[PDB]
mmCIF file of C-alpha atoms in Angstrom:
data_model
loop_
_atom_site.group_PDB
_atom_site.id
_atom_site.type_symbol
_atom_site.label_atom_id
_atom_site.label_comp_id
_atom_site.label_asym_id
_atom_site.label_seq_id
_atom_site.Cartn_x
_atom_site.Cartn_y
_atom_site.Cartn_z
ATOM 1 C CA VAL A 5 2.327 -5.040 -7.857
ATOM 2 C CA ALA A 6 0.336 -2.111 -6.653
ATOM 3 C CA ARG A 7 -2.147 -4.084 -4.537
ATOM 4 C CA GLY A 8 0.121 -4.817 -1.541
ATOM 5 C CA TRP A 9 0.485 -1.087 -0.194
ATOM 6 C CA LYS A 10 -1.207 -1.877 3.265
ATOM 7 C CA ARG A 11 1.763 -3.961 4.237
ATOM 8 C CA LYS A 12 5.217 -2.899 3.979
ATOM 9 C CA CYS A 13 3.896 0.297 2.252
ATOM 10 C CA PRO A 14 3.114 3.014 5.015
ATOM 11 C CA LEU A 15 3.060 5.503 2.435
ATOM 12 C CA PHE A 16 -0.524 4.985 1.318
ATOM 13 C CA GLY A 17 -2.871 3.417 3.774
ATOM 14 C CA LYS A 18 -6.298 4.698 4.220
ATOM 15 C CA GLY A 19 -6.083 6.526 0.677
ATOM 16 C CA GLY A 20 -5.071 2.950 -0.929
#
């Protein structure tokens, strides 16, 4: 999934 990028994915935060 590409919706949970604000949890364990610090790569895309504000940009997500």
